[PDB]
Amino acid sequence: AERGELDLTGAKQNTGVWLVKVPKYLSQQWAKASGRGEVGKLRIAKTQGRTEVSFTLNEDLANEHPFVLQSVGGQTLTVFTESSSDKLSLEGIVVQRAECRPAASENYMRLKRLQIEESSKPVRLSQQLDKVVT
């Protein structure tokens, strides 16, 4: 029992967590939801020799996101926490890694272009003065 001690009960329980990469518009929609209670549904389907992971956006949040699994054993990933009371703890170990991709193929680039217009807003260029200053 000390300030610098990290709680290691999560590692002793062998709790397995998932780390997933998502694109920025999904994060923006989740931030706009402001934790109402639900942002979407996570779907998993296992066949006789293959698996299929996807995420479906909430219909209210909108007004398909297939997932791709990847190799994990190249590194060992675990998650710890820091509290306001300075009580460090360990949540668990990452056992599976995935990434999120949009199902939109051609129209999605349009949104990318709009984000370009959202990202080219603060960059600023010189102007021409018709009249010299007075």
Whole-number minimum distance, CB 123 to other proteins, in Å?
Answer: 8
How far is residue 2 CA from its own chain's centroid? Answer: 34
Binding flag, residue 45, other proteins (CB under 8 A): yes
- CA–CA distance, 88 with 77 (Å, rounded to integer): 17
β-bridge pairing 16-21 and 88-100: parallel
Residues in the chain: 134
DSSP 53: E
Restricting to residues 104-133, name those near other proteins by CB under 8 A. Answer: 109, 112-113, 116, 119, 124-133
Whole-number minimum distance, CB 63 to other proteins, in Å?
Answer: 19
Restricting to residues 23-42, name those near other proteins by CB under 8 A. Answer: 23-24, 27, 30, 33-35, 37-42
